[PDB]
Amino acid sequence: TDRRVIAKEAMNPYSLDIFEDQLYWISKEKGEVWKQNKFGQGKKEKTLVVNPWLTQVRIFHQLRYNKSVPNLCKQICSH
Amino acid sequence: FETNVFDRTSCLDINECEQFGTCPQHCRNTKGSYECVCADGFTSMSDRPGKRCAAEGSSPLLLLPDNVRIRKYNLSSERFSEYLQDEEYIQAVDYDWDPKDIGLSVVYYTVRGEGSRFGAIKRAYIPNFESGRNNLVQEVDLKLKYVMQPDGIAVDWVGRHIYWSDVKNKRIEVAKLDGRYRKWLISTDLDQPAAIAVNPKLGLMFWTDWGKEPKIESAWMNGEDRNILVFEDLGWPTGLSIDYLNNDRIYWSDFKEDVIETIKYDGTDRRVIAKEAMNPYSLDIFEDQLYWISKEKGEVWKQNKFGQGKKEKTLVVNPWLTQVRIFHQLRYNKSVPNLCKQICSHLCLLRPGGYSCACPQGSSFIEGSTTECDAAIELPINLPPPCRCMHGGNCYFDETDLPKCKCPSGYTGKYCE
Amino acid sequence: DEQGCEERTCHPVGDFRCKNHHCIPLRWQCDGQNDCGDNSDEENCAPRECTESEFRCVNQQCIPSRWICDHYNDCGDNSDERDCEMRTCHPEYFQCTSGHCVHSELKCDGSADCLDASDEADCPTRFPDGAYCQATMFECKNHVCIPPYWKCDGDDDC
Ligand SMILES: *[C@@H]1O[C@H](CO)[C@@H](O[C@@H]2O[C@H](CO)[C@@H](O[C@@H]3O[C@H](CO)[C@@H](O)[C@H](O)[C@@H]3O)[C@H](O)[C@H]2NC(C)=O)[C@H](O)[C@H]1NC(C)=O
Numbered sequence: 001t002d003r004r005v006i007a008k009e010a011m012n013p014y015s016l017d018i019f020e021d022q023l024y025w026i027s028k029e030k031g032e033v034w035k036q037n038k039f040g041q042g043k044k045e046k047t048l049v050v051n052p053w054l055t056q057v058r059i060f061h062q063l064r065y066n067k068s069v070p071n072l073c074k075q076i077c078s079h
Numbered sequence: 080f081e082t083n084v085f086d087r088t089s090c091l092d093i094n095e096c097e098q099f100g101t102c103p104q105h106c107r108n109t110k111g112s113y114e115c116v117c118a119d120g121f122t123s124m125s126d127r128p129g130k131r132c133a134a135e136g137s138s139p140l141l142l143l144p145d146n147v148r149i150r151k152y153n154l155s156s157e158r159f160s161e162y163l164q165d166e167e168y169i170q171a172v173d174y175d176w177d178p179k180d181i182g183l184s185v186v187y188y189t190v191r192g193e194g195s196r197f198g199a200i201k202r203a204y205i206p207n208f209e210s211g212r213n214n215l216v217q218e219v220d221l222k223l224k225y226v227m228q229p230d231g232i233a234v235d236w237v238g239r240h241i242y243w244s245d246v247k248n249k250r251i252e253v254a255k256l257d258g259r260y261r262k263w264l265i266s267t268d269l270d271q272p273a274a275i276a277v278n279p280k281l282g283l284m285f286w287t288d289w290g291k292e293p294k295i296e297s298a299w300m301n302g303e304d305r306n307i308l309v310f311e312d313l314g315w316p317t318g319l320s321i322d323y324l325n326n327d328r329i330y331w332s333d334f335k336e337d338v339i340e341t342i343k344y345d346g347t348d349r350r351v352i353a354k355e356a357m358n359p360y361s362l363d364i365f366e367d368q369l370y371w372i373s374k375e376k377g378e379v380w381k382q383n384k385f386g387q388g389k390k391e392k393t394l395v396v397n398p399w400l401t402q403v404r405i406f407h408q409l410r411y412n413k414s415v416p417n418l419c420k421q422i423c424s425h426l427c428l429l430r431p432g433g434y435s436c437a438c439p440q441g442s443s444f445i446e447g448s449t450t451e452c453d454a455a456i457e458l459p460i461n462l463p464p465p466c467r468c469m470h471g472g473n474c475y476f477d478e479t480d481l482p483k484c485k486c487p488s489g490y491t492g493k494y495c496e
Numbered sequence: 497d498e499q500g501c502e503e504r505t506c507h508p509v510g511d512f513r514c515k516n517h518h519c520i521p522l523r524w525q526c527d528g529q530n531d532c533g534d535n536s537d538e539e540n541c542a543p544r545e546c547t548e549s550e551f552r553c554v555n556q557q558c559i560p561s562r563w564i565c566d567h568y569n570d571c572g573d574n575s576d577e578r579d580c581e582m583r584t585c586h587p588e589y590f591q592c593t594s595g596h597c598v599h600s601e602l603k604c605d606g607s608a609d610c611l612d613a614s615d616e617a618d619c620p621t622r623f624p625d626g627a628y629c630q631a632t633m634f635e636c637k638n639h640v641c642i643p644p645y646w647k648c649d650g651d652d653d654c
């Protein structure tokens with residue numbers, strides 16, 4: 001429903017990931033990592049420049065994934 | 080074919096050194112034989128005939144000038160140690176080993192401009208001792224103006240001169256190590272010049288023009304004499320290397336035709352070391368091996384320098400990789416002496432078996448004298464004191480902006496020796 | 497007017513037809529401008545030969561010979577602004593100490609067109625009374641006649 005533009009002119013972003021209050025994206029043209037406030041505030045900030053071969057940015061952290069969510073499956077299904 | 084054991088020419092003293100690849104470093108003529116021997120600082124791995132030579136020192140590293148980083152890779156440790164970062168458009172690199180006898184070494188790289196922003200040539204201290212980002216690195220621009228595309232660069236350690244080439248300028252300009260006095264020694268009859276090498280022992284500079292006229296020249300280091308070594312089937316001869324240890328033989332790589340070949344200093348004996356290198360872009364020879372970069376896949380390949388064996392993949396850096404330079408002491412023999420006797424006012428270029436005075440561009444010698452030019456004498460400019468923390472120590476600048484070391488517990492001393 | 501352009505024809509000579517059925521003068525073709533919106537005029541354009549008073553940039557683009565070291569990098573590749581110390585200059589222009597050319601008219605005019613401001617600092621006071629600023633203006637160390645209102649006005653123009 002609520003469609004908003006967090007940032008514009010991200011220099012061809014290719015992947016995203018959100019941790020805490022920041023969003024990171026990859027400008028695959030020159031493989032630069034850019035960060036900005038996840039609500040669209042502030043300004044984009046360059047952080048890293050890796051090889052153009054870079055294809056994704058993934059935030060590796062414990063709290064990035066809510067492992068608490070319980071499993072509704074009760075080993076009923078065969079496969 | 081006949082019993083003519085002595086038909087004019089017979090079995091006798093044979094200079095096997097004339098045969099290609101007879102010995103890795105130094106072959107001596109023997110009667111119907113040869114004497115293969117290494118040089119100073121090189122020890123034999125095997126028997127005297129065809130003895131492999133090992134560098135008597137620290138493991139060699141490969142400076143890899145990526146687009147935004149200049150990282151050094153220790154061949155033996157098989158690891159990458161970061162040296163420079165945060166820069167952009169880095170094209171070619173070369174080093175002067177120890178200029179001031181300290182542990183560190185000065186590395187001269189090139190930055191190519193884009194659009195309005197002009198390029199520049201910059202130097203900084205690479206530590207010969209293992210040290211990553213622990214030691215801050217201070218790039219210093221040589222402040223050379225009108226630098227468009229510094230495709231290639233070379234260092235004259237004997238003459239204390241830096242030779243570089245510009246594709247857009249089409250000029251092989253030389254200057255002092257700090258860039259005090261810059262001269263256009265060729266600046267003519269060039270169409271897209273390329274990587275350049277200098278041989279102080281022979282007083283000859285060698286460059287390639289991968290332009291419409293693929294040529295490889297062997298002009299004097301002062302530029303007085305110019306000639307073309309090869310001009311046939313050269314395609315795009317980007318990349319060059321001089322085997323100073325072995326007869327000062329010249330090696331070049333053909334990016335367009337995908338072949339790497341070699342010629343003598345006069346360009347007489349032309350041979351193909353290897354073929355189908357997947358568009359090599361740069362070369363460098365150490366001991367008995369030659370390394371090249373297939374820019375397409377940014378991969379390093381090694382093979383026997385005499386053409387024997389097979390190509391072997393070693394590393395795969397980012398596609399941005401532009402050059403491979405073998406960082407070692409014995410790569411650039413510093414024994415060659417300086418024939419300059421501080422006679423020239425500003426610049427003392429080298430020449431085969433001698434030295435000739437020159438003047439900075441836009442200036443001329445004073446009338447009646449071949450030693451003093453008309454331009455003013457610029458004061459020498461030296462680099463700021465570099466971070467020297469040897470074993471992982473982190474350097475911090477004091478209130479006096481003097482680099483001091485947070486030496487670790489593993490070592491001690493001013494530089495954590 | 498625009499209905500029958502598909503049926504409309506072009507002049508046999510001196511006219512270029514674009515993919516939009518647009519007829520444009522042959523001179524306008526390959527002029528660096530999209531005379532017709534489809535860019536058919538500039539679709540395939542070998543660079544033209546420069547004339548006697550035109551400098552050829554490394555971009556293979558011709559610019560007026562007066563624009564070499566223009567101090568405005570008129571050519572995109574910035575190849576015009578090079579070797580300005582070794583270029584001397586044209587007879588009707590004054591050369592800054594940096595090596596760039598500037599109009600001799602703009603010399604000592606109170607406007608430092610040269611970046612190094614040599615165009616204004618090499619001349620005596622605009623009047624023998626003992627000052628460079630006629631209209632009560634501000635004269636900095638570079639002798640630039642910054643307007644009296646512009647004196648200490650925000651950014652350091654001088
Ligand atoms: C790399 O550098 C070393 C020096 O650090 C070079 O050693 C040099 O060896 C050559 C002989 O191969 C010397 O030439 C001659 O040596 C004989 C004695 O063996 C002497 O009687 C002759 O008068 C002559 O000196 C040469 O002088 C010496 N280098 C010096 C001292 O400058 C080594 O050859 C170099 N490796 C290369 C360039 O392949």
Ligand SMILES: *[C@@H]1O[C@H](CO)[C@@H](O[C@@H]2O[C@H](CO)[C@@H](O)[C@H](O)[C@H]2NC(C)=O)[C@H](O)[C@H]1NC(C)=O
Pocket residue numbers: 137138139140153155156207208209
């Ligand atoms: C590349 O890595 C090797 C292995 O770490 C370095 O060589 C060692 O250096 C230490 C310190 O001097 C010695 O104690 C070891 O005996 C050396 N062993 C080997 C296998 O070489 C080498 O110096 C590194 N490259 C450099 C610094 O040029």
